[PDB]
Design a protein around this ligand. Structure first.
Ligand SMILES: NC(=O)c1ccc[n+]([C@@H]2O[C@H](COP(=O)([O-])OP(=O)(O)OC[C@H]3O[C@@H](n4cnc5c(N)ncnc54)[C@H](OP(=O)(O)O)[C@@H]3O)[C@@H](O)[C@H]2O)c1
Ligand SMILES: NC(=O)c1ccc[n+]([C@@H]2O[C@H](COP(=O)([O-])OP(=O)(O)OC[C@H]3O[C@@H](n4cnc5c(N)ncnc54)[C@H](OP(=O)(O)O)[C@@H]3O)[C@@H](O)[C@H]2O)c1
Ligand SMILES: O=C(O)CCC(=O)C(=O)O
Ligand SMILES: O=C(O)CCC(=O)C(=O)O
Ligand SMILES: [Ca+2]
Ligand SMILES: [Ca+2]
Lengths: 416, 412
C-alpha cells in the first residue's frame, strides 16, 4: 500500500526542530512512504558520545546513497558545553558535512499569497547560491596570548620553496588571529552551478565580493566567474536576455533590498549564510525557506532547514507551554530530498507525493491555518491573539488531515 | 565667510562625490564659515602620484587637529589600475585612515517623515557601531599557485616555543588563503564605545558574532564585551531599563529585519560595513546616512559619507547628461565634523550653523524638494516623473536658498 521510497540518509537534530522532525515522519511521511532509511542521530548528546564520529559517518552515507535530509543541530560554544556537560566544543555538523560533500547551497523563500512581506518590493523570488566550502567554516583561529609575531606561510609539496607573509606583530597585549582558505576547483564548481541555475530560471546572476579589499582572495572568485562566463555561458545568457554582473557586496545588498527580486545571487560562504536569513525574514519568516546542498557530482544532494533549533521555543516546550513553531522549512527538507530521490530512481509515485505535500503546506496556509509567525505577518505581532493561529501540533495535524485528503482524491482520480 | 570655524582636515574624493564635494563648500559652507582648512587630495590621481603618501599625511593631520571630513574615494582593483594607468593597486584610503586612527564608526539613517521605508517595521533608529580596526581590512591574502601546505604560526616574544597550525594542505590544484587578526585593546575600546553609546541614547545594545563557528576569534569579542558589561555598565543599563545581549549574526539580522528599530548594534568590521548599507537602503536611501569614526581618545573624529563615489551617475555626468544624486550624506559629513569642532572649541556660532544646515536639509525634503531616489521611495521608481524630483544642481541650489533664509531669519 505504501510508496516505495528507496534509500535516504536521515539526520536527527536538537531542541524544537527535533520535536518537529519526529512529527513530520510520524504524521506526514511514514504513513504513506516506506523507505530504506539510514538514520544518524546528530543530536548533541549522541555526537558527544561518539566524539562527533556519527557526523562524519552520516556525511559518508550521503555520498553513498546520494540523498540526505537533515534536522537543525546545536553547534556548541562554551555555554553549551556547560549546559550539556560536553567533552569538547564540537564543530558544527553542517561545517563537517558541507566540507566533505562540497557544492553550493541554494536557498529560496517559500511564498504564500496571503502573507505580507517586511520588504515592500520583492514580488519575485531571490535565489541565493551559497558556496558551501571553505572560508570561515573551514578556518583555523586561535587566541594570541601576548606579544609576538603571527605569520602565514605557503610551502609547495616538493618542499623546494617557502613563502612567509607577516600577519601582525603584536607589540603589547594579545588578540586573535586566524587563517582561512578556499580552492580553485570548488570555486569553479560554485561558478558552474550558479550560471546553470540562472539559465534554468531565466534570471540574471549576480556575484558579490569584497575584491577591492581582499584583492587576491576575492579577486580570484571574480576572475574565475568572469572567465567561465565569457568562455562557456555568455552566448546562452544573451539568448535568454539575461546577464551576469559582479558587484561589491555592499552595493549588492542595497540593490537587492530595493529590487523587485527575480535574480540568482551567488554568495561567498559567509555572505550566503547571513544574507539568506535576512532574505528569509524579509519575505516574512525564517520558517519559510528551502535549503538544498547541490553537490558537484550532479547526483548527490542534502536537504535541510537553514534556520536553527529554535531554542526559545524549546524552552517553552520543556515547561509544557504551547508552542507555535513553523515546521514548513523542516517539511520541505523532506519534500526536496524525496523529490530528488524520485528523480534519481525515476519514481513517479514518489515524485507525486513530494509535490503533493508541498502543495498541501501552501494551500493550508493560504486557507488561513498557520503558525504564530505567519499570523504575525498579516496582523502585527502586538495584535496577534491565540485564536489567530494553530499551535505546532494543531498545524501538523491540519497538514496531516489535508495531506490524507489530497492523496485520497488522487487515488480516486482518472489520472491514477 | 564670517563665522570662524577653526582647524578642520579636509580629504578630497573621486567621481560623483567629488563633484558634490565642491558644490557643498562653494554654496553651503564657505560663504558663511571661515576655516583653517588643511586639505589633502585623496583623489585617485594624486594618491598614485604621491605613492599613497597623501593618505598617511591626512590621517596624521586628523590626529593633530582632532577633526576631519572625508569625501568618498576610489579603492582600485584590476579595472581601476587599467582605467587610471596606476602604478600599484592601492589599498583603500579608509582602511589606511581607520587603521591609523582606530575606534568605532557609528552609522545611522537620516530620517525624513515623508519618506517611506522599504522595511515595514522600523519606526525607531538603528545605530550600528562598526569596529573600525583589523579583520578583513588589515588582512594578508594571497593566491595559492599549487599543491602544498598553508600554515599559520605564532612566535612569542618571550622566546618560548613557536606554535604552528595547519590551515590547509592543498592536494589538488591551488586556491587562495589569508591571515587576519584583531587586538584585545581595540576590542575593549570597541566595547566601551558601544556600551556608552547605548547609555547616552537610552537604547539596548546587541553584539553580533559567529562565535559558534569562530570559537576563539569571535569568542574573544563576546567574552570581552560580557566581562566589561558585568564589571562596568550593567547596573547603569538596568537603571535605564535597557539590556545588552549577544546574538549570532544570523539571528541578529533576522531579528533586526522584523523589529521596530530602536537599538544599538555592535558589529565587527566586515559586518558593520555591509549591514550599514542594508540598513541605510532599508530606511530608503544610501544617500541618507551619517558615518562618524569616533576615535578611542574621546577627542578625535572623522566624518564621512558611508556610500561610494556613485560611478554610474558620474558616467552620466561625464557624458553631459542630467543627474540626480543625493548629496545629504556628504553634507552631514561637514555638519557632523563642524559640530564636533564646535564642541571642542565651545563655539556657539559654529554649532548653530551645523545644526541649521541639517535642519534645512530635512525641511527641504519634507517640503517636497528632493532628488530622484527619494521621489522613488514615495511613488516607486517606475512611477517617478520629471516633475517629482530636482537634479543635483537644482537640489544643491534649493538648499543654498533655504540655508540663506534660515540664517538671515535667525540673525533677527
Ligand atoms: N541548520 C542548522 O543546524 C543551524 C542553523 C542555525 C543555527 N543553528 C543552531 O541553533 C541553535 C539556536 O540558534 P539561535 O539562537 O541563533 O537561533 P534560533 O533559536 O534557531 O532562532 C532564533 C529565533 O528565530 C526565530 N525562528 C527561527 N526559526 C523559526 C521557526 N521555524 N519558526 C518560528 N520562529 C523561528 C524565533 O524567533 P522568536 O524568538 O522571535 O519567536 C527564534 O527564537 C544554536 O545552537 C545554533 O548553533 C543550527
Ligand atoms: N567611503 C568610501 O570611500 C567608499 C565607500 C564605498 C565604495 N567606495 C568606492 O566607490 C566606487 C563605486 O563603488 P560601487 O560601484 O560599489 O558603488 P557606488 O557606485 O558608490 O554606488 C552604487 C549604487 O548605489 C546607489 N547610490 C549610492 N550612493 C547614492 C547617492 N548618494 N544617491 C543616489 N544613489 C546612490 C546608486 O544606485 P543606482 O545605480 O541604482 O542609481 C549607485 O549606482 C568604488 O571605487 C568603491 O571602492 C568608496
Ligand atoms: O552550522 C551552524 O552552526 C549554523 C549553520 C547556519 O546558520 C546555516 O546553515 O545557515
Ligand atoms: O574603503 C572602501 O574601499 C569601501 C569603504 C566602504 O565600503 C564603507 O566605508 O562602507
Ligand atoms: Ca544561517
Ligand atoms: Ca560599504
Amino acid at each position: 500500500k505504501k510508496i516505495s521510497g528507496g534509500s535516504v540518509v536521515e539526520m536527527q537534530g536538537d531542541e524544537m526542530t527535533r520535536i518537529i522532525w519526529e512529527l513530520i515522519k510520524e504524521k506526514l511521511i511514514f504513513p504513506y512512504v516506506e523507505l530504506d532509511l539510514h538514520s544518524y542521530d546528530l543530536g548533541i548528546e549522541n555526537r558527544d558520545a561518539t566524539n562527533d564520529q556519527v557526523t562524519k559517518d552520516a556525511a559518508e552515507a550521503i555520498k553513498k546513497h546520494n540523498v540526505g535530509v537533515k534536522c537543525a543541530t546545536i553547534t556548541p560554544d562554551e555555554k553549551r558545553v556547560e549546559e550539556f556537560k560536553l567533552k569538547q566544543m564540537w564543530k558544527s555538523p553542517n561545517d563537517t558535512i558541507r566540507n566533505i560533500l562540497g557544492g553550493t547551497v541554494f536557498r529560496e523563500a517559500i511564498i504564500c499569497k496571503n502573507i505580507p512581506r517586511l520588504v515592500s518590493g520583492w514580488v519575485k523570488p531571490i535565489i541565493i547560491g551559497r558556496h558551501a566550502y571553505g572560508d570561515q567554516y573551514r578556518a583555523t583561529d586561535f587566541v594570541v596570548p601576548g606579544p609576538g609575531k603571527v605569520e602565514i606561510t605557503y610551502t609547495p609539496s616538493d618542499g623546494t620553496q617557502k613563502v612567509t607573509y607577516l600577519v601582525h606583530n603584536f607589540e603589547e597585549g594579545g588578540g586573535v588571529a586566524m587563517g582561512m582558505y578556499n580552492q580553485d576547483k570548488s570555486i569553479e564548481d560554485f561558478a558552474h552551478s550558479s550560471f546553470q541555475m540562472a539559465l534554468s530560471k531565466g534570471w540574471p546572476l549576480y556575484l558579490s565580493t569584497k575584491n577591492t579589499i581582499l584583492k587576491k582572495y576575492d579577486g580570484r572568485f571574480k576572475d574565475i566567474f568572469q572567465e567561465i562566463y565569457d568562455k562557456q555561458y555568455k552566448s546562452q545568457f544573451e539568448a535568454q536576455k539575461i546577464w551576469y554582473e559582479h558587484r561589491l557586496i555592499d552595493d549588492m545588498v542595497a540593490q537587492a533590498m530595493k529590487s523587485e527580486g527575480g535574480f540568482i545571487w551567488a554568495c561567498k560562504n559567509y555572505d550566503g549564510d547571513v544574507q539568506s536569513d535576512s532574505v528569509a525574514q524579509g519575505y516574512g519568516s525564517l520558517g519559510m525557506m528551502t535549503s538544498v546542498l547541490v553537490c558537484p557530482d550532479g547526483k548527490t544532494v542534502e536537504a535541510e532547514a537553514a534556520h536553527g533549533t529554535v531554542t526559545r521555543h524549546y524552552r517553552m516546550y520543556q515547561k509544557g507551554q504551547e508552542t507555535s513553531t513553523n515546521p514548513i522549512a523542516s517539511i520541505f527538507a523532506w519534500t526536496r530530498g524525496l523529490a530528488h530521490r524520485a528523480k534519481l530512481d525515476n519514481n513517479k509515485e514518489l515524485a507525486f507525493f513530494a509535490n503533493a505535500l508541498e502543495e498541501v503546506s501552501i494551500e493550508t496556509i493560504e486557507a488561513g491555518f498557520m503558525t504564530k509567525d505567519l499570523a504575525a505577518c498579516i496582523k502585527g505581532l502586538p495584535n496577534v491573539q491565540r485564536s489567530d493561529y494553530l499551535n505546532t501540533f494543531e498545524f501538523m495535524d491540519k497538514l496531516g488531515e489535508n495531506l490524507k485528503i489530497k492523496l485520497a482524491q488522487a487515488k480516486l482520480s482518472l489520472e491514477h
